[PDB]
Amino acid sequence: NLQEKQTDFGMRVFSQVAQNSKGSNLAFSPYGVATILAMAQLGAGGNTLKTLNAKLGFSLQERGMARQQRLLQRDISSEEGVELASGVMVERKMALEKGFRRGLGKAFQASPHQLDFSRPDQALDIINAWVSDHTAGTIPSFLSSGALTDETRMVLLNALHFQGLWKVPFDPKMTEERLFHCANGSSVPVPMMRLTHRFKYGEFVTPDGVDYDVIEVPYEGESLSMLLVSPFEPETPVSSLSSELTTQRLQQWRQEMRSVKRQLVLPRFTLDSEVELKSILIQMGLGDMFNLAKADFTRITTEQPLCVSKVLQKVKIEVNEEGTKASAATAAILFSRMAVEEITMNRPFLFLIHHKSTGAVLFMGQVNQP
């Protein structure tokens, strides 16, 4: 039940982006964003806490919730091939309340890491090496120069790493080099993997009459799979499949999908994405945690004012005949001016990497083809 609320919030962030830009971010971790906001929630008080319980839809400070969170993370990370790590990087001169530290350790195994932010280049190197060590070196420069300065006080940090082999791998002899015409007048070859096999599959319709199908492509080990969601009309906005991205509706897909012989076609692709989500979060009602004059993080410290400045995520995804490798690093920075130029593409062919036992959606994004 906690995971359902966390997953739903994380997919609501994905959907909120789709409502604006337009199209969606290429690749995203709902798990990473919900986790970072939960860590910030453990430090909130008054109206900031109130708003956070209301908009996140879960309340990590309530009795028993930290214990649940710990169990959920333990389950997800118990899979061979998936690792989770969290941390609170904190200005060394800034005392943290024991209660906040304790809650972070209990819920998220997030230990403190002292940094001297008066040497922001060294702090940046330490944070980046931490993220690199928890992403198999696949995200080695999480923060770029200037993200931290001498005014930064805290970075809340999470890293998720996944490697899985397909239960039924693709045969590379069946991958066809398909030429796609591009805007610039060039053609590019894309390797299109093709596998015919029994896969769980179903057709569905949204409350607004949009037809789509879902196919599940399992990884070895019975607990993780990739769901591919595809509208029958390819020029459907991503936002049209938004009503669908909930835990309840995913459970409905599972109830109905049956194994049938299908030819599955999936490109061999890689994605690199970087997003900063302050403006999206403010749109979703979380304005108070970003307002220095209004924010209440007195559970973090009562010794100086604090608010969140940026919420940053970087995701890397590699899909091929053998399996999938994916990493996400997410952070909330308290005092920072960093900026990220955002990239949305408007294609509604979605993937979700889903952990069955918990309902967690580890990664989601667009199936990359021109």
Side-chain angles (χ1 to χ4, degrees):
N1 202 271
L2 179 60
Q3 182 64 55
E4 171 166 21
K5 299 162 179 181
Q6 292 183 355
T7 289
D8 290 5
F9 164 75
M11 292 196 301
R12 252 179 263 129
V13 172
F14 178 92
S15 293
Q16 183 65 42
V17 170
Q19 257 89 292
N20 294 310
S21 285
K22 293 162 181 185
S24 82
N25 297 336
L26 255 304
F28 183 69
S29 174
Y31 196 81
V33 178
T35 288
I36 285 298
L37 270 291
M39 285 166 77
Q41 192 181 40
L42 287 179
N47 198 81
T48 297
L49 176 51
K50 161 82 172 100
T51 304
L52 276 167
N53 297 345
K55 302 302 180 178
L56 292 183
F58 53 93
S59 299
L60 241 68
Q61 293 188 26
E62 293 181 356
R63 45 188 316 212
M65 292 285 162
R67 190 180 338 280
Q68 327 255 250
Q69 179 67 79
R70 189 207 224 260
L71 293 180
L72 277 174
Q73 292 234 312
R74 181 186 271 174
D75 183 12
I76 288 164
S77 69
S78 75
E79 315 298 332
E80 181 63 50
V82 356
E83 297 97 45
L84 292 189
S86 290
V88 56
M89 316 336 234
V90 55
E91 163 59 46
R92 180 183 180 175
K93 288 178 181 171
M94 192 177 68
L96 305 182
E97 295 274 277
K98 183 67 144 164
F100 181 60
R101 268 176 299 131
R102 179 180 291 249
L104 284 171
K106 180 175 197 304
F108 294 108
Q109 290 192 315
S111 296
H113 298 277
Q114 310 303 312
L115 301 182
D116 179 5
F117 283 112
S118 81
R119 319 174 71 103
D121 307 320
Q122 169 187 46
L124 175 141
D125 278 351
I126 296 168
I127 287 171
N128 284 350
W130 188 96
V131 170
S132 180
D133 189 49
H134 296 273
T135 58
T138 74
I139 306 177
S141 291
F142 177 52
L143 300 185
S144 57
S145 305
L148 316 173
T149 68
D150 56 30
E151 301 168 11
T152 300
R153 291 293 169 263
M154 175 174 295
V155 184
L156 296 171
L157 240 194
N158 174 255
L160 166 44
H161 173 255
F162 165 56
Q163 295 184 211
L165 302 181
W166 297 125
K167 183 177 185 126
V168 179
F170 297 80
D171 175 4
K173 276 319 191 182
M174 305 294 312
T175 299
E176 134 189 312
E177 299 295 319
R178 176 166 156 205
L179 285 165
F180 286 76
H181 182 93
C182 290
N184 58 17
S186 284
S187 289
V188 299
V190 171
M192 303 296 301
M193 317 183 300
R194 293 178 291 169
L195 169 62
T196 297
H197 198 265
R198 287 176 62 86
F199 294 101
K200 284 166 179 274
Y201 173 80
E203 299 181 28
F204 300 95
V205 70
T206 73
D208 284 337
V210 174
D211 294 318
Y212 63 98
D213 66 30
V214 183
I215 189 169
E216 181 186 342
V217 190
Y219 296 102
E220 287 184 353
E222 315 309 336
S223 62
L224 295 146
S225 61
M226 179 171 284
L227 300 167
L228 298 167
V229 184
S230 304
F232 285 92
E233 161 63 54
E235 278 213 322
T236 298
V238 183
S239 72
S240 287
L241 295 171
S242 269
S243 65
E244 307 300 279
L245 298 170
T246 67
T247 292
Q248 179 173 98
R249 188 52 160 158
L250 261 64
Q251 294 175 337
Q252 298 183 355
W253 295 347
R254 191 163 178 213
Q255 295 162 19
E256 289 184 52
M257 286 163 73
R258 314 267 183 269
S259 289
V260 300
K261 190 187 248 325
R262 297 278 310 169
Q263 182 188 65
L264 169 60
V265 177
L266 178 63
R268 181 199 294 164
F269 64 101
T270 289
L271 254 28
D272 280 288
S273 182
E274 180 184 19
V275 68
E276 193 284 306
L277 299 163
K278 173 156 79 196
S279 66
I280 288 297
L281 299 167
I282 290 176
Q283 273 169 24
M284 302 175 66
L286 292 177
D288 255 36
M289 56 176 274
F290 299 107
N291 188 324
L292 188 44
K294 303 186 159 308
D296 184 333
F297 285 103
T298 54
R299 280 185 170 88
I300 300 197
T301 182
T302 63
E303 294 186 346
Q304 67 157 286
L306 289 179
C307 69
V308 177
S309 290
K310 303 286 162 175
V311 175
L312 173 68
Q313 190 175 73
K314 269 181 175 202
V315 179
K316 172 59 168 56
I317 306 291
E318 173 171 354
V319 169
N320 58 30
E321 283 83 347
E322 293 67 48
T324 291
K325 296 172 191 187
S327 292
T330 312
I333 311 179
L334 292 76
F335 303 137
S336 164
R337 292 190 301 281
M338 63 159 298
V340 170
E341 279 290 343
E342 256 139 78
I343 315 299
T344 63
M345 183 220 319
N346 195 33
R347 298 306 185 278
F349 294 89
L350 300 192
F351 67 89
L352 294 83
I353 294 179
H354 182 244
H355 186 253
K356 255 176 276 212
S357 181
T358 61
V361 177
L362 298 185
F363 297 92
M364 70 193 294
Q366 279 172 343
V367 168
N368 198 27
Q369 87 179 30

